[PDB]
Ligand binder design. Structure first.
Ligand SMILES: O=c1ccn([C@@H]2O[C@H](COP(=O)(O)OP(=O)(O)O)[C@@H](O)[C@H]2O)c(=O)[nH]1
Length: 358
């Protein structure tokens, strides 16, 4: 009879991380008859949308004390009391600050349990990275995060790389027929520079050789700035804008139908779920080799390419070769190149990472 507690600071209730957590919780509560799951949130308000939790048992610590020393002390106390009521065997922290809370509350509460980190963002691009050292073991969604954890002094043996899940598909998006233009796809929020660097996408494509089209599914404040840039570069007649779409992969299948590659030019990424989605549909991905994620999914020459951050020359080379056919990715086998990310095997490896450390 195992009970697992997932804890973190309040989240919005919409986002990639929330989806992964509710699914991991839900399949946990079916695994061994039903080893039980519940949540604990540290909140300064109750603005978190509760939809994703409708089937999940959860409790909260509310404190809007403005001095953070006092607020954290109250959070630790509230969690210490919940620990006594609940007696979890395992506590998994979905952010780094909660590893400190869980550690301090374990000592205060006198309870025994094992503390795992399971952060969903690169430690270096987020606020409280040094609190990672308060967890017992670590669940890393990428090789990049495992490296940042080791950088703080943690032994590699105490860190399991668990990736993140994606659903198996039963449709393959084929390449365009030969003699048709190459079809590139960009799916994501538009930022001209900043995190997403749509500037780099447009700069690279403008320098390429051969016939191509770019389909952009997404929106953002930089829309007009990106549209002006495509006009400036003279590529606007090869770009089709779809705005934000609730079902981007339905738009791909029904409206675009044939895709050469998905492109991602980001400066950084928390976890680029978009790449996994694309490869689940057999679409190769050419991505910047940024912190973090793309290098754990992309196998160069097999399901796409990586380029060193800022190496737009290299990015262009990858585009030219896939347009010409000098390099060809086989869409029919690409879905199998991300085997370890698919739901069932993901959960088996995730489950084994938790219980192997006990
Ligand atoms: O028009 C869009 C563009 C993005 N996505 C989805 O949003 C995620 C990636 O979006 P984003 O680039 O904003 O990543 P984030 O910054 O939210 O982590 C992927 O799962 C996409 O399938 C979507 O549903 N509609």
């Amino acid at each position: 009879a195992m009970k697992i507690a997932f804890i973190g600071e309040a989240v919005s209730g919409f986002g990639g991380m929330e989806t992964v957590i509710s699914n991991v919780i839900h399949t946990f509560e079916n695994s061994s008859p039903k080893i039980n799951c519940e949540m604990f949130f540290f909140c300064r308000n109750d603005k978190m949308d509760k939809a994703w939790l409708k089937e999940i048992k959860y409790a909260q610590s509310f404190s809007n004390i403005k001095l953070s020393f006092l607020r954290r002390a109250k959070h630790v106390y509230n969690f210490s009391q919940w620990l006594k009521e609940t007696s979890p065997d395992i506590v998994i922290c979905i952010d780094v600050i909660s590893c400190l809370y869980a550690n301090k509350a374990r000592k205060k509460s006198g309870k025994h349990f094992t503390i795992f980190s399971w952060p969903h963002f690169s430690l270096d691009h987020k606020k409280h990275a040094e609190c990672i050292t308060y967890a017992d073991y670590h669940l890393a969604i990428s090789s990049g995060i495992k490296e940042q954890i080791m950088a703080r002094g943690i032994s590699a043996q105490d860190i399991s790389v668990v990736y993140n899940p994606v659903s198996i598909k039963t449709v393959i998006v084929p390449p365009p027929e030969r003699d048709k233009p190459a079809v590139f796809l960009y799916v994501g929020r538009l930022k001209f520079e900043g995190q997403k660097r749509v500037k780099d996408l447009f700069d690279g494509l403008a320098r390429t050789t051969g016939e191509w089209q770019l389909h952009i599914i997404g929106d953002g404040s930089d829309f007009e700035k990106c549209q002006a840039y495509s006009r400036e570069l003279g590529i606007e007649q090869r770009v089709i804008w779809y705005g934000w779409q609730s079902a981007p992969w339905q738009v791909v299948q029904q409206k675009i139908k044939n895709v050469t590659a998905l492109l991602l030019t980001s400066a950084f990424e928390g976890f680029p779920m978009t790449l996994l989605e694309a490869m689940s549909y057999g679409i190769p991905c050419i991505s910047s080799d940024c912190m973090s994620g793309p290098r754990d999914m992309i196998k160069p020459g097999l399901n796409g390419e990586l380029y060193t951050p800022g190496a737009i020359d290299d990015f262009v080379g990858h585009l030219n070769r896939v347009i010409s056919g000098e390099v060809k990715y086989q869409h029919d086998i690409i879905p199998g190149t991300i085997e370890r990310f698919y739901d069932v095997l993901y959960f088996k490896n995730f489950n084994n990472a938790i219980f192997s450390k006990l």
